[model samples]
Target: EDWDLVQTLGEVQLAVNRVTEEAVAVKINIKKEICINKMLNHENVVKFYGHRQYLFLEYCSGGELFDRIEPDIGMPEPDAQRFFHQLMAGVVYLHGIGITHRDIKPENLLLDERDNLKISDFGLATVFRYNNRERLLNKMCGTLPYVAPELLKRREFHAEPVDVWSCGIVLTAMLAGELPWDQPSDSCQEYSDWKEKKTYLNPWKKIDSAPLALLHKILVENPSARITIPDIKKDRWYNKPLK
Candidate 1:
């Protein structure tokens, strides 16, 4: 017991015969984290301390955003607004630094002891740069619930907008306590209506019309029409000072 007793969340792989493939992911995750310190310095993103076979992240005892959210009722307006504001701010920073967090879901959002949100799990993230304004992304790499329509369609997509769309999904989940649609597809009637810009019953009646209007703009079916980071900042609903 000479070594200091350290407790870290370990993700071990059972690589009986496939060590290389398993190790590749670990290596990539480590590399992505190395870039994070240079690119991101926001309070909303998780702090990476060290890594090897296991990563030593700043221990966030509050658990995932998914765990805290009520499956039926959702968070209160102030709490939801505070969480969404932090998340969007974090995304804006990530995008500014040419990074795309392909995975943006409640499961990846962590909270510190003070209940401040922290975006974690950069395993699916990548840095994309523009050469003459190219979008610089193509691969589909996010959860179905949060994946942008363009990515879901398997088309070449803009990394920034893809993250914006996922933020929309996260925002909706926090405000409504449920997803607008499990998967955006014709099979789901609500999803189809949303895509068609047709009328569909909204589940959250308690939410203010102003916030709902902003959500409508953010959750555009067309990626090209989707609201941008600057637009979110300008929106009245997003700008109300958190109490």
Candidate 2:
């Protein structure tokens, strides 16, 4: 985390060669997690290795999964699957503990040298009573392309499902060497068009799904009725190489 949030904003903008202050807004928009620095357990998620108040946190070598999608550096399907499976394991554990990782995206999910996935930046995470399915998010958060339909509509959406959607997007990117959520048909077309057709645009269509059924469950447009984490094990797709 940057001391002066605005400074990091400029840094992000310049790094992407994009002219937008949304980075600052996204950073400021995130609800800081109190006692979150103490959230450490599974290796699939980032361990709260070290921190300082009003300062910054220190992590080891692995950086973001986003930057690794470039041309020659593309990750294979086996490695990609392994990374996303780790993501699911992390999310499953979080949901088990009643923690909702509201801002799930490639930027927040980090990587280590061994192609290991580590979910990080829990600023938007929260813990509620186990039985509570109520969502209390107010501000619009996370990267636009990867956002779930309910979140984009600003409706009271369940967190676990939305996180799965983002995970699906990330998994595609990790293997396809490009983004999944994109389109020029930015018209009033239905979410189905975007998810079923547009989201599978050329570069990403080549994404190798070990099995069609598992991918179908993930790309389901309906938010409330998408795949559950545990259901992943039922697929032969999970048995294939992770790359």
Candidate 3:
């Protein structure tokens, strides 16, 4: 609705990963590419206007969240809270439709004109069952650092809870100005055990004061007992901090 489709722009192409006797996996990739523009309409999700051979998506005014945060060490607590709140709102909406953005890091989360966040790059995202009961996603796809501990364990996982783990890392990164799991050539699960000790401990064995308990819940190791949206709204510890 914003810009005009003037002429055919140059197409973006990618190489094929594998080839079968019947055809190539690129065919399936083309199908996924076709759906990229069609999967839209929500504020958090990108709105697909239309697509030709190559999908031409709506141009977001603001750039990627990674683009913004990469320039700095990280964001402040207030800034992190504000962004995380909106980010989860979008995540919840996507969950409502049983769609899991398998890649749920800052890089894939784009910003709009007003700087509100939007989930972009559905290339690796897949649809799943989001019933209240336990479900398992078997895919081992995503960046190792932002990936959940359960995922790194090579076990089946609920996409939403796995996302909760990554969000926790993102929020912590915002506060501490660096990732808790950041070390040279280290894996995600290998580093999950140290996240709490490194991030929350002081010179003495004291817990660093956090404004929101939601931040605590965000980094829970067990996805089975992770905090939900309802818990966040009802928690007394949420609004008690120096925002």
Candidate 4:
């Protein structure tokens, strides 16, 4: 197969530019196999094809959200808000269906040719609730900067709040182009300063008080105090005119 695919420039180019892509969806056991199927069909979530053995996903030519943002500076307010809401819409769909993406960060956010956001890398995601018997996930997973402080407690915590917290971190990064700390914790000085001030230090001076207010609400240290998806939609800043 390798020799056949490498025989000519046409063959090599064909192999490189093939329309089809492959995904391996292996299950550790009976419980997790069903969880994999739950990721299908949402507009913001990545689309998958084929059987349990091999999955084919739609190709995203625009690369990652991480690469899209400029370094050493923050994104403009409207652009950050646009992507944040797009991210929220997808997460709301997942949570409505009772799934929790344990990892949510710019690196996992993919973009298509249309500049549409696609949430990928569902490897750490799991179903938190099947039918009301809540599954309190305590695993300390996800990228360091984005993980919720509650997860660090090592105490059983609701999966939804953790996701919300990660979303807050994502929103912050989109606007700031950087995280407040290497890891978010009460012990982390920058995060402690953020909690004390009840305000985030703006990297982009163009941002107004309303956006910072929203970020403060979402990034609250108390899980119960953190803003929800519903709150995000209702924020006055979120309804502001787009560029």
Candidate 5:
């Protein structure tokens, strides 16, 4: 009752808690989001402040990471690497907890006042492991362009690699300010060209060789062979310091 709406973004609302005078992003009918967000405690993960029909999440003043990107010319490489590192931190924590954020894209990544990245939007997330037993996921979820190729096959696939593939897509968007294709399916001409190792493609051609190597390991069509988060952390390009 002490909440006042400041603005709205789809099902979420920016509200101020009158009692505490704190700004929070509010969402209703988000039982799954609540459950998943509750257990998460990481600097890169959005802070959740309990729920009673309306979930109170930390308001990210810097707005969506997508808003900061330029279509044809992405942010500087150093900035992109900073954001990507933060994103990887969030993904590593989520996967460590046995949860997979099926939807990982620039829009779902938020920025705080200090420009730190925060992984948000857990509506499509799911638990794929429990008590040392791993399970394959079959549901086709996530944005078309960011969706992993294995997910498009409509076959049971490991959860972690699917996320890694999406991360690769997000990384590409950050580096080139454009997606490689509308989707990773064989039918997408751009994707097909990329899979065929066509060097003349627009975005792929523009990306630096260092990050391109990392992307190659991440965007592998074979889920079993996709680069793991730990391995990605060790990649020289990923560890490059900001200048």
Candidate 6:
């Protein structure tokens, strides 16, 4: 145990390697997290080192993307676009590898020293497909505010679309500095309003027409009709470079 613990958050701890003198995030009692993380190797995805009773991960000194956002104000267009692009890139990589990250909220999206967005937390991820064949997932997981409406319906659903839905919520949170709704269920007034096409809502009204169009495609109620990652890449707003 040569690592010096710097900070602890539940089962996770930020530590410094005594030998290398490098900072690393450590996770205790990881099974699926380890299994799923080990298979990931992308710039946007958190780098996974080794597991020795504890899992070693790249320490994101910049902290969670959640903290970078300003409530109600949100980030600038360019900044939000940059982070959203990185997040989509990471998600695209995960889906390409047949995996789906059930959780995609800002809390799970970390930023490194240079402020590069990295997708962290694989605890709720799973392999949704193998080769070309896909499987449906039934378990209701992930944060309520970011969860897709289909997930609350408690029916077997395609895993990838669920992630797409969460990604849309995340993009909205980045642009609006708040979630569009508490949860994608009828019980949540904001969600119900959106479902009923009350376009004159606070957050929805705050968003510009271009990105709002993309958001509409992403946050579709029907999971089967939700925009895929490839389609997202083709969107004008998504392809727009920082101004």
What is the per-residue lDDT of model 6 for residues 1-243, given as tens digits with 9 covering 90 to 100? 499998896488989878888888998725888899889999999999989778899888888998999999888989999998899889989999999989899999999999999998888889898878998998888999998898888679889889999999988988888788878988888988887778688798878888889998998999878898889999999888778
Q: Model 4 segments beyond 4 Å from truth?
A: 1-35, 51-54, 198-207
Model 3: ten consecutive residues of lowest lDDT: 19-28
lDDT of 1 by residue, 1-243 (tens): 012323333362212113332111121155665655445667888876555445445556677898878886677878888898899878888877777889999988988889899988777888786443556577768788887777767657778888888888888788777887777766877787776655345543545777788878888877788888899889988877656
**Backbone clash numbers for all candidates listed:** 0, 7, 0, 0, 0, 0
| Residue-pair clashes, model 2 | 7
Alpha-carbon lDDT of model 6: 0.88
Q: In order, what lDDT does every prediction score?
A: 0.72, 0.61, 0.60, 0.71, 0.89, 0.88
What does the lDDT read for residue 25 in candidate 2? 20
Output the TM-score of candidate 4: 0.83
Off by over 4 Å in 3: 1-30, 36-39, 70-73, 130-135, 182-208, 235-243
TM-score of each: 0.82, 0.73, 0.72, 0.83, 0.96, 0.95
Q: What RMSD does model 1 have?
A: 6.6
Could you tell me the C-alpha RMSD of candidate 2 in Å? 7.8
**In candidate 4, what are the lDDT values of residues 1-243, reduced to their tens digit?**
121131221101112223433322221132353346454578788765433433335446667788877765667878888888889888988888878878998888878778889887667878888887788886777888888887886677888888888887777777767776777777787777776773435442334688877877887777888888898899988899879
Give candidate 5's error at residue 111 in angstroms: 0.2
The superposed Cα distance between candidate 1 and the true structure at residue 11, in angstroms, equals: 1.7
Error of 3 at 166 (Å): 1.3
Residue lDDT tens for model 3, 48-160: 54554545454455767766663335655566667777777877877777677778777777777898887766778776763654457897877766777777665677788
Error of 1 at 139 (Å): 0.6
| Backbone clashes counted, model 4 | 0
